[PDB]
Design a protein around this ligand. Structure first.
Ligand SMILES: N=CN[C@@H](CC(=O)O)C(=O)O
Ligand SMILES: [Zn+2]
Length: 449
């Protein structure tokens, strides 16, 4: 049992809330206006933990290292060349070390569960490992070591571009045909289940798979699983799709696939008004990765229009140049402000508070995209939560939604003090028990690279 003076519950902010948590890490009882009665008295305001709906773990290793001009027009595409050269040298052991360290940093930032969009499958020569699931299993073990919730999204990747272009050499570690991909999903069932981790279907992008492959995978019977795909991140993809099909990426997807609530459309950055409307209507989740989209010069998503139409969204750290719930949400809003040259862009008809609007939205979309029972403190949901700093003058002087505004718009990561996943404290007073060992292994890997 734990006790919070203030907690953000599904119906809104509450006081003196006593939480009972079962041995399996599930919220069993939630009583506001209660007595602490022996329960653990928490040190600040309690929020549901934030799901991270999009990650490529190995990229954290190169974070910030690609900030070197080599052309007057460096771009997403020259960055990718550099990313390819990086992933070409990574051993299974290095990948696991990077992932563990990353997930630890994620937890400290307030991310309690992650969707790993995992496309590094094979050995350095593009040959499969003795166990084809080698690298997927190492990701699961890293998540277990850090203690973070995990939806693993093994990625189908087969082509270099629309129309089934042959994969490039730089892509060799990613490549599977549909049969091998479906076998991978099969192999992953037992170990993921044992770990308490989740699974999802995943197409890298419309560039990387064919329409026929999409049909194959969706017909394979995994009808309960999330479906994730990168889409419309870069103008070049939009242009190439038009030249291939006479349609834009999102436009094509919606014409050809039965997109619904199972789906997470990552980035979706270049969505015209018709595409925005189709997304909102479908109930699919837009996977927004603000810090990476800014870092890569992707552009600004039409979040205000999307949100006005009932769109669902969540946040992902993606390339992991930033690991900050605060930064993603703050700059989601700030990007809309810079575009419109106005303030207070992302709010609901029933919720004028910006911080609360953003947090509510990202919690819900994120839980939906991961396919996990998370994103709110209700009986039957998993006990994933974070505790803010009760001694912080800004937070202590604030109440309810004002407190969210202070944190998200005037504060930072260090205001997140304690973090619980499935009823287990994994961060205490900003510290993770595995941080020392992990950093030691991590710095060695950085040196090797
Ligand atoms: N930020 C985008 N990253 C993608 C690149 C791609 O879409 O090809 C990736 O990591 O595979
Ligand atoms: Zn991505």
């Amino acid at each position: 049992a734990i006790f919070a003076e203030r907690a953000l519950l599904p119906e809104g902010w509450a006081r003196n809330v006593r939480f009972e948590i079962s041995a399996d890490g599930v919220l069993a009882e939630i009583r506001p206006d209660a007595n602490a009665d022996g329960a653990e008295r928490l040190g600040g305001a309690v929020l549901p933990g934030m799901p991270n709906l999009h990650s490529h773990a190995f990229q954290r290793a190169m974070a910030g290292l690609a900030e070197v001009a080599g052309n007057p027009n460096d771009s997403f595409w020259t960055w990718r060349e550099l990313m390819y050269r990086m992933v070409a040298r990574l051993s299974p052991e290095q990948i696991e070390v990077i992932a563990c360290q990353l997930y630890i940093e994620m937890l400290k930032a307030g991310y309690t569960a992650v969707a790993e969009f995992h496309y590094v499958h094979h050995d350095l020569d593009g040959r499969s490992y003795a166990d084809p699931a080698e690298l997927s299993l190492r990701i699961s073990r890293a998540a277990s070591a850090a203690g973070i919730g995990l939806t693993l999204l093994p990625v189908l990747y087969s082509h270099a571009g629309f129309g089934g272009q042959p994969a490039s050499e730089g892509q060799r570690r990613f490549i599977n045909g549909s049969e091998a991909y479906l076998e991978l999903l099969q192999r992953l069932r037992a170990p993921l289940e044992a770990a308490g981790h989740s699974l999802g279907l995943c197409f890298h992008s419309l560039r990387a798979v064919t329409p026929q492959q999409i049909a194959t995978v969706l017909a394979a019977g995994h009808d309960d699983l999330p479906v994730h795909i990168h889409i419309a991140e870069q103008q070049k993809e939009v242009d190439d799709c038009q030249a291939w099909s006479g349609r834009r990426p999102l436009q094509w997807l919606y014409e050809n696939v039965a997109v619904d609530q199972r789906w997470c459309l990552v980035h979706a950055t270049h969505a015209d008004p018709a595409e925005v409307a189709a997304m909102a209507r479908s109930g699919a989740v837009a996977g927004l990765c603000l810090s990476t989209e800014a870092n890569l010069g992707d552009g600004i998503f039409p979040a205000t229009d999307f949100l006005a139409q009932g769109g669902r969204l969540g946040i992902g750290s993606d390339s992991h140049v930033s690991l900050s719930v605060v930064e993603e949400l703050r700059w989601l809003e700030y990007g809309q402000r810079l575009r419109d040259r106005k303030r207070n862009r992302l709010y609901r008809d029933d919720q004028p508070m910006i911080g609360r609007t953003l947090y509510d939205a990202a919690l819900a979309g994120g839980a939906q995209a991961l396919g996990q029972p998370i994103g709110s403190l209700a009986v039957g949901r998993r006990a994933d939560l974070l505790v803010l700093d009760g001694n912080d003058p800004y937070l202590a002087s604030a109440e309810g939604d004002a407190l969210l505004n202070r944190w998200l718009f005037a504060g930072g990561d260090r205001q997140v003090r304690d973090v619980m996943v499935a009823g287990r404290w994994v961060v205490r007073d900003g510290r993770h028990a595995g941080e020392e060992r992990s950093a030691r292994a991590f710095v060695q890997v950085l040196g090797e690279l």
